[PDB]
């Protein structure tokens, strides 16, 4: 028994949170694309047999309420719980449409003794977000269980990174993360899919401005995991 | 291709720090049975075929130091670079005899752009070492320079790391035991899983006072690798 039971009932609930336009007290700007990444997401998902469901703009207080609220609902029948957050960002913080939430408030709602039809069973954490203002200029060649086990956070970027969306296609990551489940989640454990989508945003990406500054930028991924078992979608 | 080569000349280097006395300056207690880990670490890595380089009792100007010259070397027939670094710690820090040292300062050293000869190549960076003060009560039943680097920790962000000053670390403990019984089948995300899975069933704290009994312990795999990582072939 290495790997997680995914033949529960159901794979699980997948909620995607999807912020766009901020308040204009924070005077941080729209993310443009994004929608492109929600719609991508719900798809992906679905397809994987996630129970998905889509919120947009919400502010502090309602991501910590819909976090609250799913947190409390029976998992009994559920193989897993996902959790896309899609926003502006800093080192352990992701922002509501009015301000800054921090990511262990919302995590902390499923640790494994407050959220227990999810203990023993993964926890994931999709987080496309900024990670500070750092940008990456690249280099050429061309029993009893720990609460805070069974949890993945997957990140757009490394600690102190800014992360890169495009206008068009969505953001470098959920972009790559989406192609990569499609082509592997039949075959694949998770972090190799993950280690894949690693490669493909380190690899095939690279920002273009007219501005120096911002051109020619490269970015990768950051798996973090506290996971016990082999992950495997299909069965 | 999906799999680093580590068909070069060599597995490459292997430095392990481990800093047991720490100076009066510092009010920081002795880690006792340390020692054990090393020793543990250094037979494991011998046997992956690595050049083990073992350092005691650095200050944090001998840990920079020694960092910045091994960073300074030609690992050009070399497949890979490990750093296992064994002291007192907190968040995004660790420990010289005489002193805190940022991770960061010691990792930018390998950043692809300023070890040349290490560009593509995995960087692994294991340790041991409290990341806060944090308890678990537990439950019931062109590329980025930022790439190829792996960070194994003993613990999740904020918590303490536990030792046993007879056995060794919970994590290095589980660790070495995991690379002998898997190195040769499983990826190393794999092995670092049943990592996890080992030090979060197996170990629970005991204590006479309740602050301190019955406590677990889950390690952290952070991963900005772009391939699988494989110790043989």
């Known amino acids: 028994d290495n790997s997680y039971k995914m033949d529960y009932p159901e794979m699980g609930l997948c909620i995607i949170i999807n912020n766009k336009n901020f308040h204009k007290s924070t005077g941080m700007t729209?993310?443009?694309?994004?929608?492109?990444?929600?719609?991508?997401?719900?798809?992906?998902?679905?397809?994987?047999?996630?129970?998905?469901?889509?919120?947009?703009?919400?502010?502090?207080?309602?991501?910590?309420?819909?976090?609250?609220?799913?947190?409390?609902?029976?998992?009994?029948?559920?193989?897993?719980?996902?959790?896309?957050?899609?926003?502006?960002?800093?080192?352990?913080?992701?922002?509501?449409?009015?301000?800054?939430?921090?990511?262990?408030?919302?995590?902390?709602?499923?640790?494994?003794?407050?959220?227990?039809?999810?203990?023993?069973?993964?926890?994931?954490?999709?987080?496309?977000?900024?990670?500070?203002?750092?940008?990456?200029?690249?280099?050429?060649?061309?029993?009893?269980?720990?609460?805070?086990?069974?949890?993945?956070?997957?990140?757009?970027?490394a600690p102190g990174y800014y992360s890169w969306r495009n206008s068009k296609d969505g953001s470098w990551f959920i972009q790559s993360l989406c192609a990569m489940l499609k082509q592997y989640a039949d075959k694949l454990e998770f972090m190799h899919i993950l280690t894949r989508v690693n490669r493909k945003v380190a690899t095939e990406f690279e920002s273009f401005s007219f501005d120096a500054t911002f051109h020619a930028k490269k970015q990768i991924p950051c798996i973090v995991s506290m996971l016990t078992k082999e992950l495997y979608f299909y069965h």
């Open 30 to 157: 729209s993310r443009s694309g994004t929608d492109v990444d929600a719609a991508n997401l719900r798809e992906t998902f679905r397809n994987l047999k996630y129970e998905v469901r889509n919120k947009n703009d919400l502010t502090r207080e309602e991501i910590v309420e819909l976090m609250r609220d799913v947190s409390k609902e029976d998992h009994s029948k559920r193989s897993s719980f996902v959790c896309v957050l899609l926003s502006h960002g800093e080192e352990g913080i992701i922002f509501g449409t009015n301000g800054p939430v921090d990511l262990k408030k919302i995590t902390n709602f499923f640790r494994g003794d407050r959220c227990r039809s999810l203990t023993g069973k993964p926890k994931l954490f999709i987080i496309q977000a900024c990670r500070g203002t750092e940008l990456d200029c690249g280099i050429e060649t061309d029993h009893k269980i720990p609460v805070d086990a069974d949890f993945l956070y997957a990140y757009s970027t």
